[PDB]
């Protein structure tokens, strides 16, 4: 059992090894356009001393943090271990591997979507945004006398064939994803893969249409099998006015009886209607998970919320340095000292912390971050917070 | 059709209507004894010229609000309109008499629990408290390594019978009440119907145990039909310590496969887990709706964020008046002015504010709240901010 | 194995058999009130040489007929054989035995409500009425312009308690039962129990409201385990006007998603909504079995529609006669005659055909009627209808 | 937003609103050949100033009613208004725009599908048939006695490859459709598609067999998911042998547990079995929709029932003219009059009676009908029945 960057050859062993591993398998040509994505040495895998028993490699993406700051991040993805190959370490071997290589390329942060919650804690990734399931009865659905577009004229919105706007999405979404923490950069070879996706399949899903407005976009389709049920595969809109558009043109699928989107805790739809509890949350999980991979170039890195005075601090990450943190301005100061720790916290709980997405109130209840101060705490809470809603771009 | 407060022959009539709107009828003894909770003059009934057709009365509560301070709260409750009797306006009849009596009477806010989320919004009232229910697989939970209460000894917690430890229940409650919130004192009657209902029913609930340690307790009982299902009724925990002590408890019912709670969005519960997503979110519903009767009494009477510096604004509340807010060192000046509005919003919007369960942004995004100042948003949303997590008392 | 009237001594093992053999048996009390409707020798069982292994008995009702004619009516129940003595010829024996005390007693037409549809056939009854299960989704249903009582001032509709106004209920349904094809008296013992079942049962079914109009009332309950449904038990209404009103309230529970009612087929119910559609017909099934036992003594009872002119023919009964029938002035002459036979049937066909529930013209499709004449087909169909729709009175 | 009939250049985006609109559309190249069954300036869309909104058309259709009298019928179809122009009035003005044409073209009546039950009755469409799902539990069907074709020799009936006998299906359906109320012409383009959706989908329906007797067939598949039901997508016979022998041939379906069939309210096939409960009516709905357009033409035009006597009376319609109205030797004579009503009705109801699927004494018992003499009820009662019973042809 070696551990070894693949060859050409590798690959047809590393696609069998994903149809077994992986029910959503996109297959092999696909598989191949996304390996565009892969840097040279992103990729590891693990020969039986030979077929393919382990793999792994990162993707090199832009991630957007809060105050529309843009990191390089390595996106994990594509892990697998054979099933005849279990407690064997390989997986923590090939992490290993890969975050020498992701740290020693300068990557300050790294990322992926977990397959299971219980995995990826004990390599230092904390979940950094949350998914919301909205499913909206849209039959009793009316909007408030205060919800923008409700007026007389004309709708801004269209329906169209999602292939034939590609350009206006990619537009939209460009826009989206600089201005909102959890933002990616979708590169070419995602985008037709997304407009290849709302494609019907024989036996499969369904024609995707898409509603399209100036400042904003959603791709639906039906469900397979509950004809009644709308599934919005990606709704993004720049502007509140997009966003309510965009929901009243939904609400206006009178064929059907429910209307389900993916979406984050903060999106306003609920306070767009008359009856809030309408847009039932159905389901709700991690979504994007962050490695601090360099402490002080990502705490330096983004922005922090002007409204909290300055202060400093001292924070240890367990196995992972300690700095005196200064905060003021919206800016961080993050520098190698010895002085006695004021806050500490393992290295998933950062990540967690690094979107905004959850609060250092919430998780030092738990005791996965300790101080004695409790003014450090709520200091922590509102400079870490995001003014702008944290949001999951697409998974990888 | 009159309008009066009911005299003690209407009663037999407002338990029959009672009996006939709500499935939950605690039925006519309970409810004489809820009574007590009622003042003079709390109650109306509509008759038809008699049988009784219409009801609604308040209950004198006291709100803990930001800032652990404690306010006279008006609570809605036992409300019904006879089937015989939709759309002859009795509930906004019935709403308003009310609403005169409770603020001639002095009340700063009133509150209810609504039985459908598109009819109280209307009457000023605005969702101000969010229910989670959490499900935890529990044959997979294993605490994580910085979860308290983990090392060697015995368990501060024991499984007690509900009725034979009131008094240490009584007290937990009162600290955690005083402490969060959304806290309401529970009175001597209500007690006495919490442990009757932790008493098995023939054909019914089965029979309630406590899990009690010196700073908290849980109520919980198996389901009735699905019997690998602990239903955890009421956890209060005054200490982090408490909360996690509880909690390896109810994960200790090793016969059962499921335990679920209704808890609030920052019960901290997932972050004591290696798996965070093992504590499903099921459901999520609004719980307590606010209505500020008397705007400046009540702006002024809580506290706010210390982190935000001091600033100053318009806040006009739609017929309902317009106040210069002067907001620093964590309180508020709230005075009179026909100055110019900056931040505009109808009253309901003002009570999903004013427990820091809705940000000011997320209602802006909606049109819920209107200003052409996003430096006011943010500040807004900072100062209006809970440090302590907002939580739900009990249902009325 | 003898079979004789039953004795004092012999009812507590008819009781055990009933227990047995009833999943909804109401019990030795009830069982021994329902008694004082069945006649001296109205009873026969079935011993072993003795424990009983086979009883049947009839009890004397009053059937409406078409015409507002009553008569009476051999009203065949409590029909059991052990499950140790199948296959042995009880039922055929004790149904002889019975047949033969109804005829010579003098009854025109004998009844029953059947267990299942394959038994009773063959013993010369035929299944006469219908009966409709709606369910109706009440959230969206809205009246039409057309339909009465949708007007301003107070309703004529109370909710009441069903034991406060048992004379109002006993009254109506008098005046109903006169005037309906398939209306019974119902006697003091089935008011009793009726009014005992509107009772909550520990465990069981939840307590049951009333709905009152001078001319109508509703029974009604919440379902035991689904909570958004409600259960009419039953609705007589004596006028259009005492229908609409009832049903303006039912559709007036606000806190139900759907009411069901088990009616018949020309229920005007779904008219009355602007979509008729909303009033789902969920379930169909045979209701109240007719045998006639005196073919020229029922023809000759009941009343025919007036607007056929006059007609003769030749009816032969399998095994039960043939008669010279002559039908005009909605009147009836049958006298026997050896002529040739223009129509044929079996004495079920008849029993289906009698109160107007079944067209000729779909049983002689089926061939259970023949005749080589279409005319008479058409003339019969017309003649045997009933101008008020045929209904069901109760279980027995 | 301008209203007009369709150009070539406008068709693929009538074909984008009717993928996004209908779950079950047929698609472009069937869409295509469907066309050739609408007249010119059959069709009209909406542009917004240009994409299509809006659009609507009807085919023309030949409608057999009551007497095999054979109507020219406008039927409506491909009706959708786009997500985004919802309560914009477009549905009101396209419908006016169509009956104006269809109107000025001489059609007596128009026709449609409704895809909800709350929408055409404005529009003065009633619905005029009644579909009736009947499920078989066939493991325990027994035929009758006294059904046909139960003899010694063999059968008449023929398992066939539905492609290989389109001219004896075309053949049987044309004599069936020409002596049933509610019979459609098929055109040649409707069989094309008809046997296109008797071949095997790959992921969709499976293959569909045929039942072929001499003066009937049916087609019949086995369900998707649920592999003991067959369903019966169309059962065609012309004398009762041929419905006897296909029922014999479908309950000799002996792999399956169920045979399901959309059927009519008076089909005999539960009366062929030993136990009627076994044919269980699973589902029930409106059918076909009718708007009379000119009232005298179409009363005239069909036959009414022999056996009611001569009799006059003035019939109005609401905003429709006011006739007298004669019907005597199954003919009606229909004039102008200015003479006082006897009777009063919607447009709507008059479609609802039109083909003797709905009793007048029923909707007179919802107040739709109205008359203040209930001879006059029973006689048009009489007169508007149908002795051949009234189906349903086929969707549109
Ligand atoms: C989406 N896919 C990607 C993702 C990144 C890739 C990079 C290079 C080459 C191919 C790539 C394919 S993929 O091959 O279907 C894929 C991958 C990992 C997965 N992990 C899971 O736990 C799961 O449930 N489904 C997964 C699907
Ligand atoms: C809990 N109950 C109270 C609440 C307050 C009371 C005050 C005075 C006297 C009796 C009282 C009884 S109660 O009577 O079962 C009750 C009341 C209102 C309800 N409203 C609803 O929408 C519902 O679903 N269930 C309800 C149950
Ligand atoms: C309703 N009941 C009657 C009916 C008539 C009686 C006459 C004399 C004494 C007692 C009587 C009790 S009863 O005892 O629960 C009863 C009877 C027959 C039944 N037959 C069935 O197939 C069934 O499912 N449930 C039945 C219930
Ligand atoms: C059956 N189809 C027809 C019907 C008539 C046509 C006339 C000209 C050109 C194409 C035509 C296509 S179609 O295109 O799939 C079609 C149409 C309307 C529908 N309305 C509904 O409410 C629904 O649920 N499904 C529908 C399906
Ligand atoms: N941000
Ligand atoms: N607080
Ligand atoms: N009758
Ligand atoms: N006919």
């Given at each position: 059992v070696t551990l070894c960057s693949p060859t050409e050859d590798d690959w047809p062993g590393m696609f069998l090894l994903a149809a077994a591993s992986f029910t959503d398998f996109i297959g092999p040509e696909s598989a191949t356009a996304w390996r565009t994505l892969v840097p040279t040495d992103g990729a590891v895998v693990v020969r039986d001393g030979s077929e393919v028993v382990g793999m792994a490699l990162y993707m090199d993406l832009r991630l957007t943090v809060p105050g529309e700051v843009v990191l390089p991040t390595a996106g994990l993805s594509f892990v697998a271990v054979a099933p005849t190959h279990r407690r064997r370490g390989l997986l923590r071997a090939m992490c290993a591997e890969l975050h020498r290589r992701i740290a020693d390329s300068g990557y300050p942060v790294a990322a992926l979507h977990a397959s299971?919650?219980?995995?990826?804690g004990r390599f230092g990734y904390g979940p950094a945004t949350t998914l919301h399931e909205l499913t909206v009865d849209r039959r009793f659905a009316r909007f408030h006398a205060?919800?923008?577009?409700?007026?007389?004229?004309?709708?801004?919105v269209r329906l169209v064939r999602p292939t034939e706007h590609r350009g206006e999405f990619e537009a939209i979404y460009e826009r989206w994803r600089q201005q909102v923490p959890g933002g990616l950069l979708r590169p070419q070879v995602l985008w037709d893969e997304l407009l290849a996706e709302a494609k019907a399949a024989p036996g499969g899903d369904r024609e995707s249409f898409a509603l399209l407005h100036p400042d904003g976009y959603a791709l639906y389709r039906v469900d397979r099998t509950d004809l009644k049920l709308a599934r919005v595969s990606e709704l993004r809109a720049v502007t509140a006015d997009a966003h309510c558009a965009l929901w009243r043109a939904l609400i206006g699928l009178?064929?059907?009886?429910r209307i389900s989107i993916i979406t984050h805790?903060?999106?306003?739809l609920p306070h767009?209607?008359?009856?809030?509890?309408?847009?039932?949350?159905t389901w709700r999980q991690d979504g994007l998970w962050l490695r601090i991979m360099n402490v002080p170039a990502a705490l330096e890195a983004r922005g922090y919320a002007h409204e909290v005075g300055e202060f400093s601090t001292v924070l240890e990450v367990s196995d992972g340095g300690r700095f005196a943190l200064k905060i003021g301005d919206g800016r961080a100061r993050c520098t190698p000292t010895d002085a006695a720790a004021e806050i500490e916290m393992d290295r998933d709980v950062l990540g967690s912390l690094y979107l905004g997405a959850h609060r250092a109130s919430t998780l030092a209840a738990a005791n996965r971050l300790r101080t004695k101060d409790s003014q450090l705490l709520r200091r922590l809470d509102a400079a870490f917070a995001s003014d702008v809603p944290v949001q999951t771009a697409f998974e990888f």
């Open positions: 299971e919650g219980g995995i990826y205060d919800a923008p577009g409700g007026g007389l004229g004309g709708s801004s009178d064929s059907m009886e805790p903060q999106d306003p767009l209607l008359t009856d809030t509890r309408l847009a039932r949350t």
